[PDB]
Design a protein around this ligand. Structure first.
Ligand code: ADP
Lengths: 230, 167, 70, 175, 106, 50, 450, 116, 62, 77, 126
């Protein structure tokens, strides 16, 4: 319902081009200083060596997803894969692997490691463990069902960025209510309860183990629709 | 809501419903052979940089097949590494707009090339990745108008309108 | 807020606009400026300022503070 | 625009019909107004019942913030040493010296200029030359701190002189 | 020498940032290889050489004309014999501290 | 810490209320006004004493 | 511009009357009348205390000249007045009265209630009252009577603890306020507490610089908040606001600059003022631990409130009513004059910010430079705290490092805390991890590698 | 010779100091002699606030600036005892062994966080 | 940029850019080496004399 | 994902997406046999009271295997 | 258009709670269905006042809470007024509202005793 054509001195659309830097607009024209224009104009980018480097560096084509159904590798001989983390698990592993370098790197590079500890201790206790450390502790990276032992083989992350798989009794599994585990883990569920589905959390009753699955995790129907898992 | 994985197959006679006109070739070498496709790929290098460095899950679709027998999409997109074929559940693909696709990346992307049809973003929620076709492309009118691709068979209000939201 | 009728008999200043505001402003500025100049002269008649830079008060001058002689 | 909105309705200032007798037992306890009269004071924290209950709840909740302050103070005190601050050591006759001079002057204990035989003691605000209280203790503490700093500087100078003399002797001792 | 400017500080910071980004890409992707290590070492060496170059370029281009002009002005004021005697290793620094500069108004 | 007592709205309400200092001071002032002006001054002062 | 004790009382009374009338902007509304009455009562109590102090001073000296009194305040230090059955020192009672009168005006604990309730005044009225004048009365009064406040034991113990507690309380309150007016008032209270603590430090230059910078920045922030409320139809709470950055770009940018300057954030005039305030603390206080804790807590709290306000008003979800945005979202309004605020207001804000920046730069040049260009402060008590500003040791450096590390930790927490689930919550964690790794690599490479 | 002494080593009378409008803070310190020439040059050579805050060598007022800088460094080191403070911070063991300052060393606690 | 003491506090005093005059190459020979050694000794003695003065220069003003 | 690096060893997602593939994942610290899970002596009650059929049988077989290994090592003592 | 005299009159905490739940200090005058509807509407408004508008919102959590509140309200409405379950549900909703009692609640100008109310004196034709 614009009436811009009626008046001549009215602001034109061509004038409103500096607002593209803050307001997202569909492409109307590519700038001379645009990165795409720079790439498509310089004959240096037309060399075969640059194209070969572009095709043979960065992310590889093999790891890119190609199907709506995927099958990970087999942990054991007779187990059945059920659930697997896709991106959240990788990011958690990368975050836990930061301590594999930063902790030694700071130890060899900080003049006051005592000050670093006196700072980070409350950060872990009050801000970090309830955010990342305990979330990764309760994170279930991969979960399969071993039929021979009628158990669940679950591989999860460990503090220094490690992987560890354990077998837990299926009869020890109980459905954990979010309301039943709300208040006692309030800050844990408040700051970092976003990545896991509070409507689906399990518990191994043998050692009081809490198993949490990512809200974006990949679940296999064949494993879910098994006699072991009802 | 739930990411339940179910095995699918191919109809073995999938209908080719869309093929990029400019990006015609066997793969990366064929695109390098064509000068115009080479310039398009040079422009799409910013798309590759956005996907890799800026962590933007997205694909530049250059061809497509449809397997209504298996209810699957058999797209064939192009990237800095070459041509990649993607099989997608027909229930896992939804429409999306240019503003939504752009704002899906928290970091600011580079200047867009003109070879992208901004109004036809396609999000694979199961893979959670956006896809943009080529502006210069040929779309099969009969292939798109098959009874399987009807909005009555595909368009669900909850998935279409509220599944992908950024706050 | 949307303007509403006010009693013409009421001596209110609610959003009162005068068309001849220019002449009234000029008249209320000029004589006020003259009065301000006169008051400024009267106030500057009796003033105290710190001594100038580089000037030191010799204590023998009467300008220096005096003491009551018993 | 688009709708000829009428004048502002008179309901914007509704008239209050007093349904309860404003007893003289609450004189000026309610701010009277022909439109929307109010109570004299506002308690927006009506969730708290009473003043004693409110104080108890506030003291219970303030414990967490008090503990946080204590933790911050401990983290600072277990990771820092006392500093060297005080009055300007080079100036002993100013704020410090004037106090001792006035305490040694005691001009308020002299006789009247006209022989009236009435001294500063003959007043409600009477001079007192032997107070030794109030800011006098703080002045003494500041003087002690300045003396400690000056002694530290002098000891540093003496130790440096001793170090230089020992180095000269050892260089001379070797021969 | 002239003080280090915005260009030099920014060049140093950009080299450090590029190295940090490369190290992040390596560690995060676990892409640590012999070729990557050699490229990183070569980049570090080239960055050091370039950082030494801007200082050399600035110092030479600025000071050398200014130093030549100042020396020529002082040569006419003091003397080549005095300058050489100062350059001679037999001079005493104690007297050199007590020597007066004829171009010092004081 | 899995549960933070400072994360609940009750802690948030107490903090945003300025530790209820306003409530305490207002209750004390109201008690003073009720006891002094009406009870002590007007009633015991004017009605009774005067 | 008071020259005599009568002039100071006249000025205080005029300020009180002006505040009472200004707060009563909507005289037809009796709800604000309660706040106006509370403010008037507080001002009257302050005026009574000031009158009692002035009467005591006159009975002591019978001279109303402020300059002469300051030049003669050291005379009668050794004296006492027989009040009831107690005999307190002459300086003690007058100093206590002056300090109480200042605390009533310059909002302190127990007397800061009227400051938050004073938000019922219009936007410019609140901007004027909160930034200075009513808020700057106490600091100016204390600075004018600097020699009198120098030799008071009651002031010595009262000023540091009261200032630190008030600053901490104001900061914590501003950290929890959703109303823009309430958040701004609590931040102003925190700034007044910090200014009082600086006055307790004994260095006047830091007090003057903090006053100027805080006043300018608070005025800018108050103007931005008033503009936002005007766009929100007199709604001051940020809980029902959001997406206003696209509506008001100028307001968003000005608010960002003002919050960066005012919140004591690092690398600014606020950071310099905070460092100067932390430098001059004396360690002879009996309640030193609590004072230090309160000072640190009040220093750290500004950034959280500023960031929360900025994000909620400008870059949060559309928590505002659909009417506020959609009514101006009509295509018809699109023209060369489209603006959510007034061009005159925006230009005034820009000019005021530029002038304030220039004046603060000039003040820092005159005071904070190597050559002290300040005139005589008329103070005979000069502390050695300037030595630390000229040449401190590594202990103060490590203390400042600890403070900056707490600030950086708070910034990181506010940067990556996922208070709500989101499509990029995992992506936010990945971004935070990448930032930490890159920061570690840059710290390693820039100091050791190159 | 003295750090507070001016290049010409002359004492300024109270009348001259008041005529120089020297700050009372500077008058409190012992570096008045050097600050007198620097103040005289600055008053005789006007520089803007941006100029003075931006000039590194203080422009024309250079020798007086250096003398005042030395005097102020001495004054601020003595009043803060920063010399012995930094000495003890460099090595708590060496300072305790050398007996540089008994009072400073007797309460010298570096702190666990600051490298124990 | 002009006040990096804040960066020198929290992040420490990092590595500065290479700042050197590189003007001693005006001459050549063992005389240049002797001059460089004399300059190093002069810098060390200047540090020592500064320490001695800052330690003994406390009693200059009384 | 990797620069100046070869992805020859990486498993293709095309191979991964196929159900029934011969892909096997070997993970560190992966306990594929609960031999020591149900091993416990000096129980306050009987092993049958404390443990169920599955755990009891697994522990019994583990003990038998350990005894067999020890006896096999005893032939050269 | 409710008279926002919640903090303008010297009403007790019980009075404030009654005004919040049913809008009247004497909710016993309200009927069963009327009281149930008023409680449901007040609970929805208070939930939106903390989960749809506030510090940080979550649309999915708000929807889930709304569904739970709707189920509880349907159960209460289909129950008898003289039922222990209905009274228990009413108490639960009142306690949920009381836990959400925000002293600095946003008062819309459309309220009779609002903050912006009483700003101007409207002159009648008289
Ligand atoms: N004169 C009075 N005496 C006692 N209480 C009063 C008086 N005026 C007002 N109130 C209190 O103020 C509140 C507001 O009453 P009002 O709104 O006029 O009645 P209603 O809610 O029936 O319209 C009442 O709950 C009442 O308790």
């Amino acid at each position: 319902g614009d009436i811009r054509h009626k008046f001549s001195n009215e602001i034109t659309d061509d004038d409103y081009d500096y607002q593209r830097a803050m307001h997202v607009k569909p492409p109307k024209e590519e700038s001379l200083f645009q990165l795409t224009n720079i790439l498509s104009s310089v004959p240096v980018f037309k060399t075969r060596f640059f194209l070969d480097f572009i095709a043979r560096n960065l992310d590889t084509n093999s790891a890119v997803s190609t199907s709506d159904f995927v099958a990970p590798p087999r942990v054991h001989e007779n187990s059945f894969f059920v659930y697997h983390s896709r991106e959240l698990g990788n990011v958690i592993r990368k975050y836990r692997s930061l301590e594999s370098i930063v902790l030694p790197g700071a130890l060899l590079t900080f003049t006051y490691p005592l000050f670093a500890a006196f700072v980070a201790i409350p950060s872990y206790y009050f801000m970090f463990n309830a955010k990342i450390y305990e979330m990764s502790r309760r994170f279930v990276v991969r979960m399969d069902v071993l039929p021979h032992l009628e158990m669940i083989s679950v591989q999860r992350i460990g503090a220094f960025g490690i992987l560890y798989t354990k077998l837990h009794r299926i009869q020890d599994l109980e459905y954990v209510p979010f309301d039943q585990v709300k208040e006692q883990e309030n800050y844990l569920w408040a700051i970092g309860g976003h990545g896991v589905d509070n409507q689906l959390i399990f518990k191994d009753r043998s050692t009081g183990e809490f198993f949490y699955f990512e809200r974006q995790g990949v679940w296999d129907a064949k494993g879910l629709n098994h006699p072991l898992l009802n | 809501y739930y990411n339940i994985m179910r095995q699918v197959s191919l109809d073995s006679n999938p209908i080719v419903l869309y093929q990029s006109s400019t990006f015609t070739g066997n793969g990366l070498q064929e695109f390098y052979e064509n000068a115009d496709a080479l310039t398009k790929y040079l422009k799409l290098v910013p798309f590759f940089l956005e996907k890799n460095l800026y962590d933007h899950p997205k694909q530049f679709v250059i061809k497509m097949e449809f397997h209504p027998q298996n209810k699957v999409l058999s797209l064939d997109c192009l990237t800095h590494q070459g041509v990649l074929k993607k099989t997608v559940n027909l229930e896992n693909l939804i429409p999306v707009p240019y503003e939504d696709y752009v704002q899906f990346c928290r970091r600011k992307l580079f200047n867009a090339p003109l070879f992208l049809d901004t109004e036809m973003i396609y999000f694979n929620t199961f893979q959670n990745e956006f896809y943009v076709f080529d502006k210069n492309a040929k779309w099969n009118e009969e292939g798109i108008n098959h009874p399987e691709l009807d909005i009555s068979k595909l368009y669900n209000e909850k998935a279409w309108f509220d599944s992908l939201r950024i706050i | 807020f949307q303007k509403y009728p006010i009693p013409r008999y009421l001596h209110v200043g609610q959003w009162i606009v005068n068309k001849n505001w220019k002449w009234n402003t000029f008249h209320m500025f000029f004589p006020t400026a003259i009065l301000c100049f006169m008051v400024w002269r009267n106030s500057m008649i009796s003033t105290a300022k710190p001594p100038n830079y580089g000037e030191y008060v010799d204590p023998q001058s009467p300008v220096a503070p005096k003491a009551i002689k018993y | 625009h688009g709708w000829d909105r009428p004048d502002v309705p008179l309901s914007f200032n509704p008239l209050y019909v007093h349904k309860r007798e404003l007893s003289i037992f609450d004189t000026n306890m309610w701010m009277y107004d022909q439109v929307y009269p109010e109570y004299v004071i506002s308690y927006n924290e009506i969730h708290l019942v009473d003043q004693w209950k409110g104080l108890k709840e506030s003291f219970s909740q303030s414990a967490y913030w008090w503990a946080m302050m204590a933790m911050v103070f401990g983290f600072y005190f277990i990771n820092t040493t006392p500093r060297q601050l005080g009055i300007d050591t080079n100036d002993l006759k100013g704020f410090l010296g004037e106090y001792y001079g006035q305490y040694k002057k005691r001009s308020g204990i002299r006789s009247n200029f006209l022989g009236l035989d009435v001294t500063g003691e003959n007043s409600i605000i009477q001079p007192n030359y032997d107070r030794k209280n109030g800011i006098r203790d703080v002045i003494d503490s500041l003087n002690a701190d300045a003396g400690k700093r000056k002694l530290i500087n002098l000891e540093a100078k003496n130790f440096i002189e001793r170090v230089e003399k020992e180095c000269e002797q050892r260089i001379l001792k070797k021969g | 020498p002239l003080p280090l400017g915005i260009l030099t500080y920014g060049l140093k910071y950009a080299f450090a940032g590029v190295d940090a980004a490369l190290l992040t890409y390596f560690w995060r992707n676990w892409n640590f290889n012999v070729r990557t290590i050699g490229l990183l070492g070569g980049l570090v060496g080239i960055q050091m050489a370039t950082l030494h170059i801007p200082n050399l370029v600035n110092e030479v281009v600025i000071q050398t004309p200014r130093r030549r002009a100042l020396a020529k002005k002082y040569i006419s004021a003091y003397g080549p014999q005095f300058f050489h005697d100062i350059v001679n290793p037999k001079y005493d620094i104690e007297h050199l501290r007590h020597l007066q500069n004829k171009l010092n108004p004081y | 810490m899995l549960k933070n007592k400072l994360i609940k709205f009750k802690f948030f309400r107490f903090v945003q209320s300025g530790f209820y200092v306003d409530f305490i001071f207002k209750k004390f002032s109201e008690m003073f006004i009720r006891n002094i002006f009406i009870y002590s001054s007007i009633f015991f002062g004017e009605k009774f004493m005067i | 511009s008071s020259g005599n004790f009568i002039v100071l009382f006249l000025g205080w009374e005029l300020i009180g009357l002006t505040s009472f009338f200004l707060i009563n902007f909507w005289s037809t509304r009796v709800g604000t009348l309660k706040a106006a009455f509370k403010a008037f009562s507080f001002n009257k109590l302050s005026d009574l205390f000031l009158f009692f102090a002035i009467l005591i001073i006159f009975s002591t000296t019978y001279n109303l000249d402020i300059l002469s009194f300051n030049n003669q305040i050291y005379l009668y230090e050794s004296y006492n007045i027989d009040m009831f059955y107690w005999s307190i020192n002459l300086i003690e009672i007058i100093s206590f009265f002056f300090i109480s009168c200042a605390f009533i005006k310059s909002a302190q604990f127990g007397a800061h209630i009227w400051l938050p309730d004073s938000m019922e005044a219009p936007v410019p009225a609140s901007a004027l009252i909160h930034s200075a004048t009513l808020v700057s009365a106490g600091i100016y009064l204390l600075l004018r009577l600097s020699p009198l406040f120098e030799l008071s034991k009651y002031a010595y113990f009262i000023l540091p603890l009261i200032g630190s507690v008030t600053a901490f309380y104001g900061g914590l309150v501003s950290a929890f306020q959703s109303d823009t007016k309430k958040t701004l008032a609590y931040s102003t209270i925190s700034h007044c507490g910090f200014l009082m603590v600086s006055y307790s430090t004994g260095v006047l230059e830091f007090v003057i610089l903090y006053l100027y910078v805080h006043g300018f920045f608070k005025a800018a922030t108050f103007l931005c908040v008033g503009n936002v409320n005007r766009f929100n139809r007199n709604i001051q709470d940020f809980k029902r606001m959001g997406g206003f950055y696209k509506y008001l770009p100028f307001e968003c940018l000005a608010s960002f600059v003002c919050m960066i300057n005012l919140s004591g954030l690092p690398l600014t005039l606020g950071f310099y003022i905070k460092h100067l305030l932390f430098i001059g603390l004396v360690e002879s206080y009996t309640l030193y631990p609590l004072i230090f804790s309160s000072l640190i807590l009040g220093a750290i709290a500004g950034v959280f409130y500023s960031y929360r306000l900025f994000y909620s008003i400008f870059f949060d979800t559309k928590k505002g009513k659909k009417a506020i945005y959609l009514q101006a979202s009509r295509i018809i309004l699109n023209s060369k004059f489209y603006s959510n605020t007034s061009l005159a207001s925006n230009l005034s804000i820009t000019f005021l910010v530029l002038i304030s920046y220039t004046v603060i730069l000039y003040l820092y040049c005159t005071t904070l430079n190597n050559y002290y260009s300040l005139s005589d402060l008329k103070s005979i008590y000069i502390n050695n705290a300037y030595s630390y500003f000229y040449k401190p040791d590594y202990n103060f450096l490590n203390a400042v490092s600890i403070l900056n590390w707490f600030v950086i930790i708070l910034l990181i927490s506010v940067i990556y805390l996922n208070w709500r689930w989101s499509y990029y919550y995992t992506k936010s964690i990945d971004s935070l991890s990448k930032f930490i790794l890159f920061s570690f690599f840059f710290f390693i490479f820039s100091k050791y590698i190159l | 010779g003295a750090w507070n002494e001016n290049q010409q080593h002359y004492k300024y009378s109270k009348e001259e100091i008041e005529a120089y409008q020297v700050p009372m803070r500077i008058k409190a310190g012992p570096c008045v002699d050097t600050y007198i020439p620097l103040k005289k040059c600055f008053q005789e050579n006007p520089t803007s606030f941006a100029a003075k805050m931006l000039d590194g060598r203080k422009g024309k007022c250079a020798k007086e600036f250096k003398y005042y800088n030395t005097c102020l460094n001495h004054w601020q080191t003595y009043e803060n005892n920063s010399h012995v403070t930094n000495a003890y911070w460099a090595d708590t063991s060496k300072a305790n062994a050398d007996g540089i300052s008994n009072t400073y060393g007797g309460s010298f606690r570096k702190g666990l966080a600051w490298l124990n | 940029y002009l006040e990096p003491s804040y960066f020198h506090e929290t992040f420490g005093h990092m590595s500065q850019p290479p700042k050197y005059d590189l003007i001693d190459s005006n001459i050549n020979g063992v005389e240049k080496k002797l001059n460089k050694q004399i300059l190093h000794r002069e810098h060390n003695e200047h540090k020592l004399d500064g320490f001695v003065s800052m330690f003994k220069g406390s009693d200059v003003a009384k | 994902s990797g620069l100046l690096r070869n992805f020859e060893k990486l498993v293709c997602q095309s191979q991964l997406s196929k159900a029934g593939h011969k892909l096997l994942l070997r993970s560190p610290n992966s306990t594929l046999h609960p031999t020591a899970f149900y091993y416990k002596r000096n129980s306050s009650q009987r092993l049958a009271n404390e443990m169920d059929v599955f755990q009891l049988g697994l522990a019994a077989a583990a003990l038998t295997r350990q005894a067999n290994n020890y006896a096999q090592l005893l032939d050269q003592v | 258009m409710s008279k926002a005299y919640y903090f303008v009159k010297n009403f007790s905490w019980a009075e404030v709670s009654n005004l919040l739940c049913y809008g009247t200090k004497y909710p016993t005058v309200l009927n069963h269905q009327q009281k149930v509807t008023r409680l449901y509407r007040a609970t929805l408004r208070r939930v939106y006042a903390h989960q749809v508008e506030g510090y940080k919102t979550d649309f999915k959590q708000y929807n889930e809470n709304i569904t739970d509140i709707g189920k509880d309200f349907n159960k209460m409405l289909a129950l008898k007024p003289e039922s222990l379950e209905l009274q228990a549900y009413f108490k639960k909703y009142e306690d949920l509202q009381e836990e959400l009692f925000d002293p600095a609640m946003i008062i819309d100008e459309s309220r009779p005793y609002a903050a912006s109310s009483g700003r101007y004196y409207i002159f009648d034709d008289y």
